Amino acid sequence: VAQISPQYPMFTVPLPIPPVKQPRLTVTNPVNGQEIWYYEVEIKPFTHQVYPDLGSADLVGYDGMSPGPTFQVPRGVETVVRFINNAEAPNSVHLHGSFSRAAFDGWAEDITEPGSFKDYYYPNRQSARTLWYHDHAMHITAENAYRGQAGLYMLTDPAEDALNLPSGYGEFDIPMILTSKQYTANGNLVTTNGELNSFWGDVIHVNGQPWPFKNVEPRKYRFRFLDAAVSRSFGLYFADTDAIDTRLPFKVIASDSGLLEHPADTSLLYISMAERYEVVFDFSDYAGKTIELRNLGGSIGGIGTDTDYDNTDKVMRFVVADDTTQPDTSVVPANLRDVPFPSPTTNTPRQFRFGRTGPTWTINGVAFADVQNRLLANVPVGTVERWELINAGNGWTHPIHIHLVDFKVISRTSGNNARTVMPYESGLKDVVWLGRRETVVVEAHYAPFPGVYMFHCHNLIHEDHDMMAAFNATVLPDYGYNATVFVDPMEELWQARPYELGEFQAQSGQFSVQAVTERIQTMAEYRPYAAADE
Numbered sequence: 001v002a003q004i005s006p007q008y009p010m011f012t013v014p015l016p017i018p019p020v021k022q023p024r025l026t027v028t029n030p031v032n033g034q035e036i037w038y039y040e041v042e043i044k045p046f047t048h049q050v051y052p053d054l055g056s057a058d059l060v061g062y063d064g065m066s067p068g069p070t071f072q073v074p075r076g077v078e079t080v081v082r083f084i085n086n087a088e089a090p091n092s093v094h095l096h097g098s099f100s101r102a103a104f105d106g107w108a109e110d111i112t113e114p115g116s117f118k119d120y121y122y123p124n125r126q127s128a129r130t131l132w133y134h135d136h137a138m139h140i141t142a143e144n145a146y147r148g149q150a151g152l153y154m155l156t157d158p159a160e161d162a163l164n165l166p167s168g169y170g171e172f173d174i175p176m177i178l179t180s181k182q183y184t185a186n187g188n189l190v191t192t193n194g195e196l197n198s199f200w201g202d203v204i205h206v207n208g209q210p211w212p213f214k215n216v217e218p219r220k221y222r223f224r225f226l227d228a229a230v231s232r233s234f235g236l237y238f239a240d241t242d243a244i245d246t247r248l249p250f251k252v253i254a255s256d257s258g259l260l261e262h263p264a265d266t267s268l269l270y271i272s273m274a275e276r277y278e279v280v281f282d283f284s285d286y287a288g289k290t291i292e293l294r295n296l297g298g299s300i301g302g303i304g305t306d307t308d309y310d311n312t313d314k315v316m317r318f319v320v321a322d323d324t325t326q327p328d329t330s331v332v333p334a335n336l337r338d339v340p341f342p343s344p345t346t347n348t349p350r351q352f353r354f355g356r357t358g359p360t361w362t363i364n365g366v367a368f369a370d371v372q373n374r375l376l377a378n379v380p381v382g383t384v385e386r387w388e389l390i391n392a393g394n395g396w397t398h399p400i401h402i403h404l405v406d407f408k409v410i411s412r413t414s415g416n417n418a419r420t421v422m423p424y425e426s427g428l429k430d431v432v433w434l435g436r437r438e439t440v441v442v443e444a445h446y447a448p449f450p451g452v453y454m455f456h457c458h459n460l461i462h463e464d465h466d467m468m469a470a471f472n473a474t475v476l477p478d479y480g481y482n483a484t485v486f487v488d489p490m491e492e493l494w495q496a497r498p499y500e501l502g503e504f505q506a507q508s509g510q511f512s513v514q515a516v517t518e519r520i521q522t523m524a525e526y527r528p529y530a531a532a533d534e
C-alpha cells in the first residue's frame with residue numbers, strides 16, 4: 001500500500017556501524033581475584049537528521065545514539081553496567097540472550113526513573129551468541145525501543161574463533177539491526193503511543209539508517225541479523241539487481257542462543273521481532289554487481305499479517321568490488337559445534353494461548369498488569385519442560401520470548417498448512433514465531449538460576465497491551481547460593497539509586513573510582529552466578 005513517510009533517497013547513505021562500547025574501568029573481584037569490566041551508559045535525548053532535506057527526528061538512546069554502542073565481551077569476563085537515566089521517562093534494561101539473575105534481567109516493574117541509575121551484573125558464561133540490550137519498562141517498552149533504546153552485545157569464545165568464520169567487527173563481521181518506522185512530513189518519528197493492534201512502519205532501517213548501501217569485497221561476510229522492530233516480521237532474501245526475483249543462496253550459521261550444529265543452506269530467512277540469525281553471504285560470484293537485500297511481500301508470504309508498503313520489499317544494497325584487497329582465508333565448517341540440547345521429556349506439555357480478551361492482548365486470558373493472575377507456572381530449577389505456544393488467530397502473529405532459558409523448537413503446526421519447523425530453527429533459540437494459526441512446542445531446561453522471570457510476545461505493541469506473564473524457576477530453602485536475595489526481581493539491594501548530574505560528569509561521589517570499586521566488590525561477595533561455575 002502507498003508509503004506514508006516522505007520519499008527517502010534510496011541506497012545513498014552508507015550503513016553505519018555502532019561503535020564498540022569501552023569499559024570506564026575494571027574492578028578486582030575479591031571472590032576470585034579476576035577483573036570485572038565496569039561500564040557507564042547514559043540514557044539521553046538527542047536529535048538525528050534522518051531525511052537530509054527535512055527536520056530532525058527526536059530519539060532517546062544508550063549514550064545518545066541508536067543503535068546503542070556495541071558491547072564485545074569474552075565468555076568468562078563478568079560485566080557490570082550502570083545504566084543512567086537522564087531522559088524524560090523511566091527505563092528497565094533487559095540483556096536478551098543472558099541468563100541474568102531475576103533482578104538484573106530487566107523485569108518490567110524494575111524501573112529506573114530519571115535522576116536514577118541501576119547497576120546490572122551480567123555473567124557472560126553462556127555459549128558465544130549475538131545478544132542485544134533493550135528497554136523493558138512496564139507499558140512503555142514499544143516507545144522506549146522505537147525511540148532507540150536497543151544495542152548489540154556480542155558474547156565471544158576463542159573456540160568459536162578457531163572455526164575461522166569471516167571475522168572483525170566493522171570488517172567482515174557486520175551487525176544488521178533491522179527496524180521498521182514511520183516519519184512525519186517534517187521528518188520526525190511518528191509515535192507508537194496510542195497504537196494497540198500493530199505499528200508496522202513503512203521505512204526500513206539497518207543500524208538506524210533508512211535503506212542504506214554498503215561497498216563490499218567479493219568474499220564471505222558474517223551478517224548478524226537482529227529484528228529490533230516494534231511489529232515488522234521479515235522474509236529476507238538477496239537478489240542481483242539484474243534479477244531481483246532470483247534468490248541467492250547463503251548459510252545460516254547461528255540462531256538466538258548461538259551456533260547451529262551445521263550450517264543451514266538457505267535462500268529465504270524468516271526473522272521476527274527479537275530473533276537473531278547469523279548468516280554467511282559469499283559475494284565472490286558477484287564481483288562487479290549490486291546485490292539487493294529484500295523482504296518477502298504478501299505479509300511474509302502468508303505466514304504473517306504485516307502491512308506491506310511501496311518500499312518494505314527493500315532493505316539495503318551491497319555494491320560488490322571487482323577484487324579482494326587480499327585473499328579471503330575464512331571458511332564455514334560443515335560442523336560448527338555440539339549444541340547443548342535439553343534432555344527430552346515425556347511429561348505432558350503446558351499450554352499458553354496468545355490471543356485477545358476484548359481490547360487487550362493476553363496469555364491464557366491474563367494481562368501482565370493483573371499481578372494476581374500473571375504468574376502462570378512454577379518450575380523446579382533443573383526441570384525440562386515442553387511449552388505448547390498456541391496462536392489460534394488468523395489476524396495476529398506472535399514471536400514468543402521466554403527469559404532465562406535457551407529452547408529447542410520441537411514442532412510447528414499451521415491451520416493454513418503453510419510450514420512446519422525451519423532448518424535454521426534446528427538449534428537453540430529464545431524467541432519462536434507463531435505465524436497465522438501456528439502452534440509451536442518448545443523444550444527448555446529451566447536452569448540454572450532460581451528467580452521470577454518474564455515471558456511474552458515481542459511484538460512490542462502486544463507486549464505493552466498486555467501479552468506478558470511470569471514463571472517462577474523454584475528451589476527449596478536448603479538450596480543456598482544466596483537464592484533468598486536473587487529470586488525477587490524487585491529486591492531492595494539491587495534497586496535503582498538516585499544520583500546528581502554533577503556527580504556523574506565529574507566522576508565523584510557514587511561515580512568515584514573508590515565508590516564504584518566498593519559497590520561492585522560488595523555485589524561480587526553475594527556470588528550471583530556461582531551455581532553456573534562448571
Ligand SMILES: *[C@@H]1O[C@H](CO)[C@@H](O[C@@H]2O[C@H](CO)[C@@H](O[C@@H]3O[C@H](CO)[C@@H](O)[C@H](O)[C@@H]3O)[C@H](O)[C@H]2NC(C)=O)[C@H](O)[C@H]1NC(C)=O
Binds near residue numbers: 450487
Ligand atoms: C518464587 O519462588 C521462590 C522459591 O524459589 C519463593 O520464595 C520463597 O518464599 C517463602 C515465603 O515467601 C520462603 O519461606 C519462608 O521462610 C521464612 C523463615 O525464614 C518464614 O517467614 C515463612 O513461613 C516461610 O517458611 C522461602 O524461603 C522462599 N525461598 C527462597 C529461596 O527465597 C518466592 O516467593 C516465589 N515468588 C513468587 C512471586 O511466587
Ligand SMILES: Nc1ncnc2c1ncn2[C@@H]1O[C@H](COP(=O)(O)OP(=O)(O)OP(=O)(O)O)[C@@H](O)[C@H]1O
Binds near residue numbers: 394
Ligand atoms: N488484529 C486484530 N485485532 C483485533 N481483533 C482481531 C484482529 N484480527 C482478528 N480479530 C478478531 O478476533 C477474532 C478472531 O480472529 P481470527 O483471526 O481467529 O478470525 P477468523 O478468521 O474468524 O477465524 P475463526 O473462524 O477460527 O474464528 C474475530 O472476532 C476477529 O474479527
Ligand SMILES: *[C@@H]1O[C@H](CO)[C@@H](O[C@@H]2O[C@H](CO)[C@@H](O)[C@H](O)[C@H]2NC(C)=O)[C@H](O)[C@H]1NC(C)=O
Binds near residue numbers: 481526
Ligand atoms: C552470600 O552473600 C553474602 C554477602 O556478601 C556472602 O557473605 C560473605 O562471605 C565471604 C566468604 O565466606 C566473607 O569473607 C564475607 O565477609 C561475607 N560477607 C557477609 C556480609 O557475610 C556469602 O558468602 C554468600 N553466600 C553464598 C553461599 O554465596
Ligand SMILES: [Cl-]
Binds near residue numbers: 349350351352
Ligand atoms: Cl497448561
Ligand SMILES: [Cl-]
Binds near residue numbers: 527530
Ligand atoms: Cl565460594
Ligand SMILES: [Cu+2]
Binds near residue numbers: 094274
Ligand atoms: Cu528482547
Ligand SMILES: [Cu+2]
Binds near residue numbers: 094096
Ligand atoms: Cu529476553
Ligand SMILES: [Cu+2]
Binds near residue numbers: 361398457
Ligand atoms: Cu503478539
Ligand SMILES: [Cu+2]
Binds near residue numbers: 094136401454456
Ligand atoms: Cu522480555
